[PDB]
Amino acid sequence: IAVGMIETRGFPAVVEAADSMVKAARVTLVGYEKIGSGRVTVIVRGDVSEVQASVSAGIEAANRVNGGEVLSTHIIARPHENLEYVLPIL
Amino acid sequence: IAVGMIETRGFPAVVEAADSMVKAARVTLVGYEKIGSGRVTVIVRGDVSEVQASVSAGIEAANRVNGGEVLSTHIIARPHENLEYVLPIL
Amino acid sequence: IAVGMIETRGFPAVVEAADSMVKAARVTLVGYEKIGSGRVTVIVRGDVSEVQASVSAGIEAANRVNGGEVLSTHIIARPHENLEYVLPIL
Amino acid sequence: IAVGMIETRGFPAVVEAADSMVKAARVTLVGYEKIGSGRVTVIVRGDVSEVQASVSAGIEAANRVNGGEVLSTHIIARPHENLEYVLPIL
Amino acid sequence: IAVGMIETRGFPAVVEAADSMVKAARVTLVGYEKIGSGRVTVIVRGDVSEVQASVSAGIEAANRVNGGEVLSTHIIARPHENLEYVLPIL
Amino acid sequence: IAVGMIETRGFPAVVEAADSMVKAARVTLVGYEKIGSGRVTVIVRGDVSEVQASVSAGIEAANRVNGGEVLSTHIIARPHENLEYVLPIL
């Protein structure tokens, strides 16, 4: 199933992105990843058109957070199931 | 229920924010998150108007801490319960 | 067996690299390593010519990720089995 | 009970602060927190006037450490007990 | 027994150093240490002249890795056994 | 008992400091602490005059490590036993 992710610098902005993503389309929040250097990603799963709508809303909400910084965003439509048991996206 | 969060650079300032937030309104401190790079967030839950009063007081106290730096602050009024079992806000 | 790895700055770009690598050749994703400072590597195993095709595709996909940054890439054709029980490449 | 904390950049300077704090007043060292980026805090508890005397001595000792850097210092006199079970200050 | 170590910035370059070290002399890879800030070290043990040959080959291979950076290298010929149970070199 | 500590930037240089300290006086290596940002400390215990001799030798050896950087050094002669059960110096 399709995967969407928004990476911010800072925790409060990632939470806003995570809230705005789930409220914007039929997606479920499945993942929260921390890789250091203040870089934090939230991950959603769903239909690709729904994930597109969630990520769109997630980005513009996280941008408006006080001291919020979006670092990177990305969507994959049909990720290989090999990723699912190696990377924390589910 | 509503969520409020203040992210500082440095530990002592996050503790002051956490103390000033709980003392400023009917909220309960539920979370302390560390994402690296000296970035640390404390999280409170309560009624949105109470969370607004706590966050307001939390910010101006943390700012007055010696070597204190507030990085980002944010309030969500009715976060989706999907966040609660993925992100450490409860 | 041959090992290929792509290191990015940021999580979403590493996931794209990991997806693009597995979809580009007969390789299996075996590893995801985090060393701090936003530096994250995904690792694939397979035949050397297949790993070359995967890494090639992995790099140009990760480069096109919004806010994606490839830091370092490398392929070893017949790594010593001593590495396999010390480093997380399998 | 009152809480005092000194955050340094570097480990040896935090240990000197921790030693100088306990030797300067009736306080007990209860906490050592690491938040990344070389930022490290030691925490003492006691009477507020005692904590003031400890923190005063802690700061000027840590400053004289070779390559020592104090980042932030702070004292709370009667922190809310809500903090005690969320933050590592006891 | 003698210890050799190469520290790189980045994971793929440390793996190349680790592979090139074991393939260059009678040494065994025993250690992989992560200290943050992208700084990563691989450690080999063996005869000092063998460790010298491995480290020599490890360095020039890691240097040729795409985006590879060697930060620090060092050899000790007869380290004290006190180190062995405190530091992860065995 | 007296405590001595040398903090370096990088792992190989901390190991050299740890080896040079134990070989320079009647001290025992007891601790290895990692606080992020490449900052790493080794800690020795012993008589204060012995710790002085070890730290002296530890510093000039770590300085001569290829890419070695000493960040901070410090000695306490009679640290309070309160530190021993809060900080990893024993």
UniProtKB/Swiss-Prot annotation, chains A, B, C, D, E, F:
Which Pfam families would you find in this protein's record? BMC
Write the record's keywords in alphabetical order, separated by commas.
Bacterial microcompartment, Carbon dioxide fixation, Carboxysome, Photosynthesis
Q: Which SMART domains match?
A: BMC
Which CDD domains does the annotation name? Answer: BMC_CcmK
Q: Name one GO molecular function term.
A: structural constituent of carboxysome shell
Subcellular localization(s) per the UniProt record: Carboxysome
Q: State which residue ranges cross the membrane.
A: none
GO annotation, biological process? carbon fixation; photosynthesis
Top-rank lineage group of the source organism:
Bacteria
Sum up the protein's function in the record's words: One of the shell proteins of the carboxysome, a polyhedral inclusion where RuBisCO (ribulose bisphosphate carboxylase, rbcL-rbcS) is sequestered. The central pore probably regulates metabolite flux. Hexamers make sheets that form the facets of the polyhedral carboxysome.
Q: What is known of its domains?
A: The tight homohexamer forms a pore with an opening of about 5.9 Angstroms in diameter which is positively charged. The C-terminal flexible tail, which is the most variable part of CcmK proteins, seems to be involved in packing of hexamers in layers.
State the similarity comment. Answer: Belongs to the bacterial microcompartments protein family. CcmK subfamily.
Q: What is this protein called?
A: Carboxysome shell protein CcmK2
Organism expressing this protein natively: Synechocystis sp. (strain ATCC 27184 / PCC 6803 / Kazusa)
**Its gene?**
ccmK2
